[PDB]
Design a protein around this nucleic acid. Structure first.
Ligand SMILES: Nc1ccn([C@H]2C[C@H](O)[C@@H](COP(=O)(O)OP(=O)(O)OP(=O)(O)O)O2)c(=O)n1
Ligand SMILES: [Mg+2]
Ligand SMILES: [Mg+2]
Ligand SMILES: [Mg+2]
Ligand SMILES: [Mg+2]
Length: 433
DNA sequence: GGGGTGTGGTAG
DNA sequence: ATCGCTACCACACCC
């Protein structure tokens, strides 16, 4: 009952099961809906406007919906009492989402099931629910629909399936801003709960993107938080990890922890940092971004989504990226897979009425000293990453040009088929009509 | 120099 | 078993 990477159904089957593919496709479709819904409606925000940002996202999105939509086989479980996760497997399988009970024992999104099992004391069973992908989309739709129907935002910007940044242009210096915006946060939460038949959202509310994002994290689960620039305090800053800053992930955290000696919070970092030391640790741009965030201000790059959302949400590239289940014996099977991949991308390119004038092939090769079979079944394991790009000349949607060039790019990279653990095929420059 | 390329990082 | 995607920005480098 298993579809391999050299089977013609592989892509279809992989993409049917892959939650990360679904996240990307859903995001791509929401940006498209935004562009189509706002064809005529030119609503833009200028640097002279005063505005409030409501950053809204679902609490434990997949866990909540998978529980409400669960099959008869899982009737007995209780979302308030039981530790519940959404995953495919039983061992080295990613927890896509876990409920707040599971989180009280230390279980976290992205953790393998087997690792999560060990954090439960004896007597307590981990409940594993399947993915309900179509129902995830239906709940998102009800969410976004509720946001519009309220008719209170000048701009509704999709971030993800379960998350949106909503903007209200307002006068400078209004009376009772904290209390009036608390009322809205409460109205929004109740309306979404009713509109989704029982999913909860949290809301971060501020006068900048960065603070509204931090306020949302502080609000979780099932609450709201309002912190304007003028409400900033050491106690607010003391509540956040460094990688709570947008643009700071695993790798930037490590560099910031090294340079500033493992600050426990953003408030510890506020006290220790200089702008010049930040730039040295993490780069000029990101160093500046962080310095600005610690004053509750957005960088110019982040603000582009408010100042010109149609430009920012315009799709500029298209690709597929498959780094799971890649086990080829020879170059013939690789070529067939690339061809299937190019055709899939061409069908999408043709759906959206564009051509491409530049492509890239990117692969993942088993590291010299890594094991032939990694600990995750069909995982890529430790790998080195290599890429080559190619200009096609005239924009085109011709399979013969595109696929021949992709296969050639694979040849230029020189990875033996059996060392291949991952492939991405990319159309880097898109042209309309 | 702007302007290219491959590499690496981030977010749901 | 298990489904580790993908768009985008930044940078080092280069010649
Ligand atoms: N690494 C990830 C991140 C996210 N998701 C999916 C499942 C999540 O439910 C959904 C939204 O991600 P969030 O990061 O908003 O996480 P949750 O909604 O699960 O939890 P929280 O309550 O912290 O927002 O995206 C995933 O499968 N794998
Ligand atoms: Mg979230
Ligand atoms: Mg969420
Ligand atoms: Mg989210
Ligand atoms: Mg972060």
């Amino acid at each position: 009952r298993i579809v391999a990477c050299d089977d013609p159904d592989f892509l279809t089957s992989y993409f049917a099961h892959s939650r990360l593919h679904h996240l990307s496709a859903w995001k791509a479709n929401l940006k498209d809906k935004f562009l189509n819904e706002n064809i005529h409606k030119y609503t833009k925000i200028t640097d002279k406007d005063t505005y409030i940002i409501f950053h809204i996202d679902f609490d434990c999105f997949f866990a909540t919906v998978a529980y409400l939509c669960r099959s008869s086989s899982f009737s007995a479980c209780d979302f308030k009492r039981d530790p519940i996760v959404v995953c495919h497997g039983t061992k080295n399988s990613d927890i896509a989402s876990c409920n707040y009970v599971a989180r009280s024992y230390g279980i976290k999104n992205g953790m393998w099931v087997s690792q999560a099992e060990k954090m439960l004391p004896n007597g307590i069973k981990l409940i594993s629910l399947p993915y309900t992908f179509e129902q995830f989309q239906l709940k998102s739709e009800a969410f976004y629909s509720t946001l519009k129907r309220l008719n209170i935002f000048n701009l509704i910007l999709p971030i993800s399936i379960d998350e949106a940044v909503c903007v209200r242009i307002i006068p400078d210096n209004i009376h009772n801003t904290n209390t009036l915006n608390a009322r809205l946060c409460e109205e929004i939460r109740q309306e979404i709960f009713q509109g989704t038949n029982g999913c909860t959202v949290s809301i971060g509310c501020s006068d900048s993107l960065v603070l509204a994002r931090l306020a949302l994290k502080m609000a979780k689960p099932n609450g709201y938080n309002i912190t304007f620039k003028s409400n900033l305090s050491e106690e607010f800053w003391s509540s956040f990890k460094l990688d709570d800053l947008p643009g700071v992930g695993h790798s930037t955290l490590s560099r910031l922890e090294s340079t500033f000696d493992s600050p426990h919070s953003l408030n510890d970092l506020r006290k220790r940092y200089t702008l010049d030391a930040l730039k040295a640790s993490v780069g000029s741009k990101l160093g500046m971004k962080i310095h600005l965030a610690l004053q509750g201000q957005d960088d110019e790059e982040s603000l582009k989504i408010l100042y010109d959302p149609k430009e920012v949400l315009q799709r500029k590239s298209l690709s597929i990226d498959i780094n799971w289940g890649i086990r080829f014996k020879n170059i013939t099977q690789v070529d067939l897979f690339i061809e299937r991949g190019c055709q899939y991308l061409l069908e999408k390119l043709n759906e959206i009425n564009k051509t491409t004038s530049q492509i890239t092939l990117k692969l993942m090769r088993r590291c010299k000293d890594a094991p032939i079979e990694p600990p995750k079944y069909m995982g890529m394991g430790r790998c080195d990453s290599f890429s080559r790009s190619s200009r096609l000349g005239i924009p085109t949607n011709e399979f013969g040009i595109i696929a021949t060039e992709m296969k050639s790019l694979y040849r230029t990279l020189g990875c033996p088929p059996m060392e291949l653990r991952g492939l991405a095929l990319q159309f880097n420059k898109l042209v309309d009509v």
